[PDB]
Design an enzyme around this catalytic site. Structure first.
Site, short mmCIF file in Angstrom:
data_model
loop_
_atom_site.label_atom_id
_atom_site.label_comp_id
_atom_site.label_asym_id
_atom_site.label_seq_id
_atom_site.Cartn_x
_atom_site.Cartn_y
_atom_site.Cartn_z
N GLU A 175 0.86 -1.18 0.00
CA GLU A 175 0.00 0.00 0.00
C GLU A 175 0.91 1.24 0.00
O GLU A 175 0.56 2.28 -0.57
CB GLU A 175 -0.89 -0.01 1.26
CG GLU A 175 -2.08 0.97 1.23
CD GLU A 175 -2.40 1.57 2.60
OE1 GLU A 175 -1.55 2.31 3.14
OE2 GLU A 175 -3.50 1.31 3.14
N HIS A 176 2.08 1.09 0.62
CA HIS A 176 3.05 2.17 0.75
C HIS A 176 3.89 2.45 -0.49
O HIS A 176 4.36 3.57 -0.69
CB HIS A 176 4.00 1.90 1.91
CG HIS A 176 3.53 2.44 3.22
ND1 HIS A 176 4.36 2.62 4.30
CD2 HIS A 176 2.31 2.87 3.61
CE1 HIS A 176 3.68 3.14 5.30
NE2 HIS A 176 2.43 3.31 4.91
#
Ligand code: HEM
Lengths: 101, 442, 54, 59, 422, 49
Positions: free
Chosen positions: B58-59
């Site tokens: 997600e990062h």
């Protein structure tokens, strides 16, 4: 005609709490409604009612009363709490009925 | 008039791509809009050695793609005034974009390039490592969170759902370009993805863009296989994290829920609406309709409390969470449990009638914007197998009556052994036994 | 008070000495005699009255 | 499955649980008594008056 | 069957405004916008506005503290008050069929309050709380103080009742404040999801505190001072600004853009802002975590503009300085014809998305129908935004570097610089 | 951090039915309670006697 007035004025003098300098409302038993009501009284009216009572208690302990001159007079008795008290009861009756709803 | 506004709401178009991916959208007059991909992937899908990948990912989803590195990617997005955001839960990840209906197609390309071609630059990974590590140290100070994780941690102890979406500390400190790579290739796949669009966009012109950037067709049948997950077992238990040095205490209690599918989730919600929520800044104060909120005010039981019906594919958590001073935890829990018991035994039509109107305004409130409408579509398909219109919902809600609420709550609440999570100066709240007995007799 | 267990002038007594009463987690069996003694007492007095009646 | 039937039927609703305890105590008594007397008497054949009784009963 | 309506906007004799817009949403969202706030407060009645905000649920001449809550709740409705230093808004939401019902209270709360001494007194200690939750975000601490150092009156007044005045506000101060400011010509009855005819019928045959401008906000002077708060926080917040443009002033569309050119609020989750000069420049200057943005406020007769920086206490110096050079370097033709191009969109975009929210839309329709009496079409505001020269922007940047600045900082200010050091 | 915390293994103590971390404990639920409650109810009848 003035019958109710005569009677009321009579019973008023009959009860004789004025002999202590108490107002009618000063003698009300402090149930839940009355309790809320008193909490709404303006600082002054509350302190005045407070002293009035403590005065009447010190009289009762002494087994005396006020001199005729100082007795509260039927038509000079100020019903200071009743307006409030009725509202407290109104509000409650509302809430009460609304919750059965 | 209500009755109709519910119908004049544009229907949601849904057409699947021969590669497994599904495209859906609610077209509106709006000049601006939102579109993104709702992936059916989470921490539940993670194993014990790759716990946190979906988050480490997600990062990196915005730190550039292969077709265009960081600076370019970011620059390209900002400069068109589009907002790119997303998230990742236990059973659901999603990356969506907020832009003007115009850029709709150049957006779809972007989304696509993110999921399919994430760069995963070896150098960006060593940075996101110290970054995540901080977010863990910052989030570790958000009692509400430390609490729900702990709830799960014990509620579903020994299973996948008992895992934090951020993952362990070791996994953050060691996850490799590999596992990250792997995770994406293993999970970010068309059959498990939904391209949802809401705003002023033509299903057509959208469905096409997908066909164009969402190519990669599957050969074998296993690629079209949406893998079923091993069941997570619920366990009535408790975890107590004590620290009298904390200012206020947190308590979360819950029973096992049915799972997205089950129609009861509707009733359950109506129920939760009856108990509602509260925090010291609610102006209704002592006059609030929620009995628990009322007592909370009268006796200053808690700083805040909330009911929740967290659902999952095959399970769920139904309960409540309150924050309170160290010395009122007990009365609070007591009154709360009481209310639950009141639910299974004496709910009135008066309460439900109101609870329904709150829920109705609640559901409508979840479709206030393109993002929220898109979120609902992205999740509806993924979870419910399609989209459920506000008109449908409303029917299911008008169907509930007191009698219904009692039977459903008794069914899931009455006499069950719950899961309990306590954090902070919790000395006053005590004994699982006592709490267990609070599960019966109004 | 919310529950009539801690507010009532009597139920608060039964409760605050036999229900919500804080007790060590490890007190052993050698801690049972206090109650037995009590019970024991209530029983003698009962049997005794019954006997004193004849 | 009896335990489940029993649970839902009897033990779940605290009111029926008590109802069970009552009816249950009734049945239990009646039988626990009979059996015990039966055990006791059998354990003392021909020693009780109940037994030797016939030897002097008859007007 | 339903289609596309058109945004009517009547105005009665007494100057009251009505702004209706049917959009066939399954839910209505009515509101009462008013020209009120901390700006009309005097040293004598400070905080009285704040309290009035919380006092929304107190008994009215028509509805009881009880029925107002149980009544609005009975229909899954809501009720709330939002306010700036110069505007107040009492709005309520609800399913369509429950508009008329949720209205009674809205009508009552804004026109017929009773502010009963006890109810009031019982409420007052609440300012103590509502205020404490708010101040949890330092973000709001420097802003109260900013407005203070940047002004001498009206707007220099805090949004949250000062501490000493907690519990000292009177039922009279309330009434008078309501009698003097909540007057027909300062009020607008906006409303989404409703037919204009009804919202109108209501407004007229229902509203009572009438005609007038009552109290006149004192012209907002400009002080230009700096307030500093040493508090130990590992994080120093700083806001250095200068007089900005007023609401309406064509000179506003300029800053709004100079704003988006310097960067104002990330668009990529956990991302760096390249389209943000300020951010980008400050990033080169500092090492550790931080954030810096373009601050812009547009008030009736004034406005504020500058930057705002959250940084570690140690790297506060380098951050605020860097934030400056990066504002001067832009005040000197450091703005590409394209930067103006990218910003012009981000602003058009941001603006448009702001109105997807039933709250956002109603707020737009409102603000206008109040501080004007007209609804500026969406294409008009566009033509207004892009019609901003590469110069106008660079000039705005100048007005900053030239004007008298007033700063506001709260954190371990140890290494933070004084306004006279920038 | 709290992320590093995990609920120990209760195999040593779990009942037969709720031992498999992949089987709904809700099925053997009415069974496990019906038993213990049976014991109690029995104790009550024994006492009642
Ligand atoms: C502290 C509790 C008591 C103790 C320690 C106790 C002890 C005794 C003892 C040692 C005897 C002689 C029993 C025997 O071996 O024959 C006795 C007799 C008796 N007790 Fe108590 N007693 C208690 C309470 C009472 C009370 C409260 C009553 C009734 C008011 C009572 C009434 C009698 C009577 C009637 C006898 C004579 C009958 C007999 O000899 O068994 N006792 N008790």
């Amino acid at each position: 005609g003035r019958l109710m007035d005569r009677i009321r004025k009579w019973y008023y003098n009959a009860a004789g709490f004025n002999k202590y300098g108490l107002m009618r409302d000063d003698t009300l038993y402090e149930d839940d409604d009355v309790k809320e009501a008193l909490k709404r009284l303006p600082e002054d009216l509350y302190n005045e009612r407070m002293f009035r009572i403590k005065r009447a208690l010190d009289l009762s302990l002494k087994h005396r009363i006020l001199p005729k001159e100082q007795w509260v007079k039927y038509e000079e008795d100020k019903p200071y709490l009743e307006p409030y008290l009725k509202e407290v009861i109104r509000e409650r009756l509302e809430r009460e009925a609304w919750n059965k709803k | 008039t209500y009755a109709q506004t519910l119908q004049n709401i544009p229907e949601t178009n849904v057409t699947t791509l021969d590669n497994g991916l599904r495209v859906a959208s609610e077209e509106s007059s709006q000049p601006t809009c939102t579109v993104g991909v709702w992936i059916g992937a989470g921490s539940r899908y993670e194993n014990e050695k790759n716990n946190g990948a979906g988050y480490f990912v997600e990062h990196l989803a915005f730190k550039g793609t292969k077709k265009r590195p960081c600076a370019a990617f970011e620059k390209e997005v900002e400069s068109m005034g589009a907002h790119f955001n997303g998230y990742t839960s236990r059973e659901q990840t999603a990356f969506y974009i907020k832009a003007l209906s115009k850029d709709m197609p150049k957006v779809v390309e972007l989304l696509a390039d993110v999921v399919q071609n994430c760069a995963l630059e070896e150098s960006q990974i060593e940075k996101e490592r110290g970054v995540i590590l901080q977010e863990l140290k910052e989030m570790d100070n958000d009692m509400t969170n430390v609490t729900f994780d702990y709830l799960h941690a014990t509620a579903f102890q020994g299973t996948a759902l008992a895992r934090t979406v951020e993952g362990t500390t070791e996994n953050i400190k060691h996850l490799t370009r590999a596992d990250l790579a792997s995770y994406i290739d293993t999970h970010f796949k068309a059959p498990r993805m939904v391209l949802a669009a809401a705003g002023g966009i033509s299903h057509k012109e959208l469905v096409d863009a997908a066909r164009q950037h969402f190519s990669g067709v599957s050969f074998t049948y296993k690629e079209d296989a949406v893998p079923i997950l091993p069941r997570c077992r619920f366990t009535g238990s408790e975890i107590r994290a004590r620290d009298d040095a904390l200012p206020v205490a947190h308590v979360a209690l819950a029973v096992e829920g049915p799972g997205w599918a089950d129609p009861d989730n509707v009733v359950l919600h109506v129920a939760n609406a009856i108990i509602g929520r509260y925090d010291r800044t609610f102006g209704g104060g002592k006059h609030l309709s929620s009995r628990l909120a009322a007592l909370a005010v009268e006796h200053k039981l808690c700083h805040s409390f909330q009911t929740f019906n967290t659902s999952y594919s095959d399970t769920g958590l139904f309960g409540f969470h309150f924050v309170a001073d160290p010395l009122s935890i007990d009365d609070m829990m007591f009154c709360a449990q009481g209310e639950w018991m009141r639910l299974c035994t004496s709910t009135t039509e008066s309460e439900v009638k109101r609870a329904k109107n709150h829920l109705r305004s609640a559901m409508v409130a979840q479709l206030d914007g393109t993002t929220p409408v898109c979120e609902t579509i992205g999740s509806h398909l993924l979870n419910y197998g399609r989209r459920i219109s506000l008109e449908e919902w409303d029917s299911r809600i008008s169907a509930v009556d007191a009698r219904m609420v009692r039977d459903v709550c008794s069914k899931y609440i009455y006499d069950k052994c719950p899961a309990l999570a306590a954090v902070g100066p919790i000395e006053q709240l005590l004994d699982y036994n006592r709490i267990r007995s609070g599960m019966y007799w109004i | 008070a919310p529950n009539i267990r801690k507010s009532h002038p009597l139920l608060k007594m039964i409760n605050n000495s036999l229900i919500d009463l804080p007790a060590p987690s490890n007190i052993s069996a050698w801690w049972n005699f206090g109650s037995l003694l009590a019970v024991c007492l209530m029983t003698q007095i009962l049997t005794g009255l019954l006997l004193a009646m004849h | 499955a009896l335990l489940r039937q029993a649970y839902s039927a009897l033990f779940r609703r605290t009111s029926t649980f008590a109802l069970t305890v009552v009816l249950g105590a009734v049945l239990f008594e009646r039988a626990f008594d009979q059996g015990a007397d039966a055990i006791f008497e059998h354990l003392n054949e021909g020693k009780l008056w109940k037994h030797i009784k016939h030897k002097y009963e008859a007007s | 069957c339903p289609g596309a309506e058109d945004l009517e906007i009547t105005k009665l004799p007494n100057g009251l405004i009505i702004a209706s817009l049917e959009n066939f949403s399954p839910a209505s969202r009515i509101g009462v916008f008013i020209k009120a706030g901390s700006r009309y407060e005097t040293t004598a009645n400070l905080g009285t506005a704040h309290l009035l905000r919380l006092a929304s649920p107190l008994t009215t001449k028509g509805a009881s503290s009880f029925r107002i809550t149980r009544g609005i709740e009975a229909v899954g409705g809501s009720l709330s008050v939002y306010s700036t230093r110069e505007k107040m808004t009492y709005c309520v939401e609800c399913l369509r069929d429950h508009v008329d019902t949720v209205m009674e209270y809205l009508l009552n709360v804004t026109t017929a309050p009773e502010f009963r001494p006890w109810e009031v007194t019982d409420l007052q200690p609440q300012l103590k709380v509502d205020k404490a939750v708010a101040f949890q975000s330092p973000q709001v601490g420097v802003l109260e103080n900013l407005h203070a150092a940047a002004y001498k009156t009206a707007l220099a007044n805090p949004l949250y009742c000062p501490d000493y005045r907690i519990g000292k506000i009177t039922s009279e101060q309330l009434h008078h404040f309501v009698q003097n400011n909540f007057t027909s010509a300062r009020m607008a009855l906006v409303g989404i999801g409703v037919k204009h005819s009804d919202l109108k019928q209501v407004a007229e045959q229902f509203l009572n505190i009438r005609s007038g401008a009552g109290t006149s906000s004192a012209k907002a002077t400009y002080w230009g001072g700096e307030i500093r708060e040493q508090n130990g926080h590992s994080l120093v917040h700083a806001a250095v600004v200068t007089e900005g443009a007023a609401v309406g002033s064509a000179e506003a569309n300029a800053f709004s853009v100079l704003q988006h050119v310097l960067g104002a609020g990330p668009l990529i989750k956990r991302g760096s802002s390249v389209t943000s000069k300020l951010y980008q420049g400050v990033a080169k200057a500092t090492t550790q975590p931080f954030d810096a943005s373009a601050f812009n406020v547009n008030y009736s007769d004034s406005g504020l503009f500058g930057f705002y920086t959250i940084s570690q206490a140690a790297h506060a110096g380098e951050v605020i300085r860097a934030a400056m050079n990066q504002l001067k370097a832009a005040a000197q033709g450091g703005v590409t014809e394209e930067d103006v191009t990218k910003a012009k969109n981000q602003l058009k975009a941001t603006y448009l998305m702001s109105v997807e929210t039933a709250q956002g839309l109603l707020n737009e329709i409102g603000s206008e129908a109040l501080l004007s009496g007209t609804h500026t079409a969406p294409s008009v505001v566009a033509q207004k935004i892009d019609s901003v020269t590469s110069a106008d922007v660079v000039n705005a940047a100048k007005k900053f570097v030239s004007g008298k600045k007033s700063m506001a900082a709260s954190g371990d200010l140890g290494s933070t610089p004084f306004l006279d050091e920038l | 951090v709290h992320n590093d915390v995990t609920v120990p293994d209760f195999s040593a103590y779990r009942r037969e039915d709720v031992m498999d971390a992949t089987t709904s404990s809700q099925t053997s639920s009415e069974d496990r309670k019906g038993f213990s409650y049976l014991v109690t109810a029995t104790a009550c009848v024994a006492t009642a006697y």
